[PDB]
Design a protein around this ligand. Sequence first.
Ligand SMILES: Nc1ncnc2c1ncn2[C@@H]1O[C@H](CSCC[C@H](N)C(=O)O)[C@@H](O)[C@H]1O
Ligand SMILES: [Mg+2]
Length: 225
Amino acid sequence: KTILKSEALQKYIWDTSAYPREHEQLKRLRDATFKKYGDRAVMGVPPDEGLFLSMLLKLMNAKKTLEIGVFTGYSLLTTALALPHDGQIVAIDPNREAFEVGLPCIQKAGVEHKINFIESDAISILNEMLSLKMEFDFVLVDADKPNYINYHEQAIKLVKVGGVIAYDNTLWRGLVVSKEEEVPERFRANQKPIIELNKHLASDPRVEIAQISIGDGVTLCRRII
Ligand SMILES: Nc1ncnc2c1ncn2[C@@H]1O[C@H](CSCC[C@H](N)C(=O)O)[C@@H](O)[C@H]1O
Ligand SMILES: [Mg+2]
């Protein structure tokens, strides 16, 4: 899976620059995910995106973060490894089984303590958090795309001024543009909420944005008010 010119170019990045710098337990988590879910493992954050997130977290001096959507935990383990010793992550996903695929790797890496995994749909947890308000340096959104705009309007209140909200899938499979037509039910579930998110973020004066053509598309939003 890639949004790049060729599969060979994507593999070149991984072979040259990501795999040689990838923590052993991140590799093991990827392999466990492929073994369990087969081609569904595509849903996970890929290794070049992971190494990018890791550097971003360090450059930002992030310490407290929020993850909306976890799956088997590739981005979660990436984040826990990148944060300082006193880092803490709140990570929300209704699928505890998927989390438990990655958990042994998280544990062997020694970073389980940095993670508060919450088995829930995210909206209800975020609503409760917004009902002292918790504050985060960084938020990663990689979950159910029809809710991404709704997550933005909660996350913009939970991230600190100067902090970052990152959205995965903002160039979803390269299919946000297409010469072919998509069928209504699939369009409404996938391309449409991303096309709409992208307009929403571009129009939001409360953030600065940078859409990055890495992974499945990552849009960084820096909160300015
Ligand atoms: N309402 C909801 N709230 C939080 N997570 C949800 C959700 N609906 C679906 N999801 C989750 O979003 C996930 C998307 S895949 C997340 C990928 C992950 N960041 C990685 O690196 O592997 C699935 O695990 C799914 O359970
Ligand atoms: Mg997703």
